[PDB]
Design a protein around this nucleic acid. Structure first.
Lengths: 131, 176, 38, 202, 141
RNA sequence: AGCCAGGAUGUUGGCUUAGAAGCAGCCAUCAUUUAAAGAAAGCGUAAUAGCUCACUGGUCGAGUCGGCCUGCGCGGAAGA
């Protein structure tokens, strides 16, 4: 039912969940196994949260129309499917960790663990904050 | 129609010679000539080829699409050539080649020799492999089929000549 | 084949082709689905 | 084995068909005794004191039963003696005129086996005779299950156990007795001559 | 070297580990013998289903041994022995199809959320709730 | 249209509790687990594997899909 009106609506209905929470994820379509990717998206839903939308309506034009209002670099979605997995208690939580650790094993591929960084800042990951 | 509404990307390194409706190409490998149908119009336009409906004919686009496909096949023939692989399931089915006349040993009762047409290089990498190469899709396919028709595969074991990709529909004889 | 005076698609992989005017059913799944004349 | 007395007159040891009479045989020899009117196959000949039994008490079960009738209704004595002698020779080949009606029925182990029996009857004990007319359990390779069951369902055959062992598959089937008539040969061509069965009156 | 690649569903109720004798080992494709027939199921087949349905996987891997992180107490046994009424599908539209209640749901939620889990512990709980409710009849407790 | 692939591990179903097998009988039973889970698609259907009901994401640049009415045609259509 990914029609034009449902797209015009779910573009914002999927921009909102990643624009109020943390970064989301994306998972390609290469090879999901009877155990690996099935039970892995299972444990994804289990630990990550019961709000993540592992579905993918991530057309390049639908993205540029809906999501690009904030963090306008979403229309490069020529790449494969998206398993959108946000995070509740702050940014880069267990969902982001699982996606980034699944891009290399325990799944087909996680499309470089796309993520959504509102800053698009200089070249440094979020690791310069010890105590 | 859709295929006819598309340009043939004729690379640099092959000679294109269109005249009237008779077409001629000269690539690295061979030389290919064929007169298109009267209802087809051709033009080069800077390192490509076009095919459209020459006026006054109903299936102008149909003939143009056929001609586009033929000219692409000729271009890729003279560019990289074609290559048909054939296999021989069946006891003692040799495909010895001498000159350019394959000596098929399918053991009917008698020798069968297949005179190839001009433009087919028929080597036999193994005892039960044929590799017909050359620069014309249609004649290579037609000679490969004239071969395979000697012993079309059977349904019960698959005995006979087959294309390298041909999936045979093997079936069970009967209860007994 | 079958020379039924009414050829129909007996399976899903049957196709209706009209070689030589004669309307034929050719099926690349089951060879018993090969019919001749519409 | 029989607990009786046998005696010797001619001892012959020679090629397949020829017979070279000798005087005595020692241990490790193979010869043919004569007039031995009592010992059946697998029974032990020995001096009055030697082994009561020497193993070998098992041979297969016939698998094919057919009836038979000579050209003239009254040569059935000739035929019965022929098929008592041939049955003595082949312990895997029975004969019993089943007293259901009267019919003299012949149980061998194969179609060609029974052909051999009938032509030996016509040639040696010359009587030209024309042949005529439960919970089954079958083993077979686990590739011919589909056809053997298609064959069993082709016959009025209901089944009992869908159990597969390890070197094959054990099929159990309830089929008529007036039926199957050649189930061994049908099965052998069907199973690549690699199956056994049994049909003993459920 | 993987999990069950030999999916052949022929195993009678869990009183005996994958009972071949009964249904008949038509799934005779099993390479299992008296070496792998008493290794792990014989020693960890007590606290899941003792005389109830707990379907066994067909896992035979190429570590030259048989071992894996086995599933939880099966909901198939949980909702058929936590019921009293051992019925289910087949006679679900005529009479009692077995018992299923919120108490059985809480039981299965706190029990089978160890290894037979899904998109949540509570989500596999809803799994057991479905395996208990879709029986065709439940006691609305 | 053409292309990069994903369907259970409560689930021999709780099942006619002899399963008649993550796709025989069978009732029905999304069964969260979703770019997906039907307890039923052609393969083995009584059963794996490797192509896979269904479904979609990824590609890709202008039309596509089925019906209904209608004209004129096509097969049906073989004899001395």
């Amino acid at each position: 039912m990914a029609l034009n009106l449902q797209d015009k609506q779910a573009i914002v209905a999927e921009v909102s969940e990643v624009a109020k929470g943390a970064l989301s994820a994306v998972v390609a379509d290469s090879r999901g196994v009877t155990v690996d990717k099935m039970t892995e998206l299972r444990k994804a839903g289990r630990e990550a949260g019961v709000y993540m939308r592992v579905v993918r309506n991530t057309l390049l034009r639908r993205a540029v129309e809906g999501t690009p209002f904030e963090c306008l670099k979403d229309a490069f979605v020529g790449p494969t499917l998206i398993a959108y997995s946000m995070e509740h208690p702050g940014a880069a939580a267990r969902l982001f960790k699982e996606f980034a650790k699944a891009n290399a094993k325990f799944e087909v591929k996680a499309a470089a663990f796309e993520g959504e960084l509102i800053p698009a800042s200089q070249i440094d990951r979020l690791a310069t904050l010890p105590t | 129609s859709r295929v006819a509404k598309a340009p043939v990307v004729v690379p640099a390194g092959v000679d294109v010679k269109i005249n009237g409706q008779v077409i001629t190409i000269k690539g690295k490998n061979g030389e290919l000539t064929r007169t298109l149908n009267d209802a087809v119009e051709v033009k080069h336009a800077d390192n490509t080829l076009t095919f459209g409906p020459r006026d006054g004919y109903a299936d102008g686009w149909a003939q143009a699409g056929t001609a586009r496909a033929l000219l692409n096949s000729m271009v890729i023939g003279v560019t990289e050539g074609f290559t048909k692989k054939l296999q021989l399931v069946g006891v003692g089915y040799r495909a010895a080649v001498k000159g350019n006349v394959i000596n098929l040993s399918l053991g009917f009762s008698h020798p069968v020799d297949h005179q190839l047409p001009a433009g087919i290089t028929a080597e036999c990498p193994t005892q039960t492999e044929i590799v017909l190469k050359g620069a014309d899709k249609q004649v290579i396919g037609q000679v490969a089929a004239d071969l395979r028709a000697y012993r079309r595969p059977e349904p019960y074991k698959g005995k006979g000549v087959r294309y390298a990709d041909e999936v045979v529909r093997t079936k069970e004889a009967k209860k007994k | 084949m079958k020379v039924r005076a009414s050829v129909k698609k007996l399976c899903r992989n049957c196709k209706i082709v009209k070689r030589d005017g004669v309307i034929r059913v050719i099926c690349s799944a089951e060879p018993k689905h090969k019919q001749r004349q519409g | 084995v029989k607990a009786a007395r046998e005696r010797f007159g001619r001892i012959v040891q020679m090629h397949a068909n020829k017979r070279e009479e000798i005087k005595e045989v020692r241990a490790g020899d193979i010869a043919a005794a004569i007039g031995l009117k009592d010992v059946t196959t697998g029974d032990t000949l020995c001096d009055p004191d030697a082994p009561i039994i020497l193993e070998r008490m098992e041979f297969p079960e016939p698998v094919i039963s057919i009836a038979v009738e000579p050209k003239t209704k009254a040569d059935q004595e000739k035929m019965g003696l022929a098929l008592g002698r041939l049955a003595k020779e082949d312990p895997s080949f029975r004969v019993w005129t089943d007293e259901e009606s009267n019919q003299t029925i012949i149980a061998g182990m194969g179609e060609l086996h029974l052909d051999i029996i009938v032509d030996r009857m016509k040639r040696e004990f010359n009587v030209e005779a024309n042949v005529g007319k439960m919970k089954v359990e079958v083993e077979t390779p686990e590739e011919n299950t589909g056809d053997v069951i298609g064959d069993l369902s082709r016959r009025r055959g209901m089944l009992k156990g869908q159990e597969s062992e390890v070197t094959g598959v054990k099929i159990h089937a309830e089929v008529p007795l007036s039926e199957m008539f050649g189930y061994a040969t049908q099965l052998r061509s069907l199973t690549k001559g690699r199956a056994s069965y049994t049909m003993e009156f459920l | 070297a993987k999990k069950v690649q030999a999916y052949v569903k022929l195993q009678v109720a869990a009183g005996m580990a994958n009972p071949s004798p009964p249904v008949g080992p038509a799934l005779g494709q099993q390479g299992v013998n008296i070496m792998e027939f008493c290794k792990a199921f014989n020693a960890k087949t007590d606290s899941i289903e003792k005389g109830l349905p707990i379907p066994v996987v067909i896992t035979v891997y190429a570590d030259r041994s048989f071992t894996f992180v086995t599933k939880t107490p099966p909901a198939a046994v949980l909702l058929k022995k936590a019921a009293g009424i051992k019925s289910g599908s087949g006679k679900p539209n005529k009479d009692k199809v077995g018992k299923i209640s919120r108490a059985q749901l809480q039981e299965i939620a706190q029990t089978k959320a160890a290894d037979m889990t899904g998109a949540d512990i509570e989500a596999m709980t809803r799994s057991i709730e479905g395996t208990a409710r879709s029986m065709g009849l439940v006691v609305e407790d």
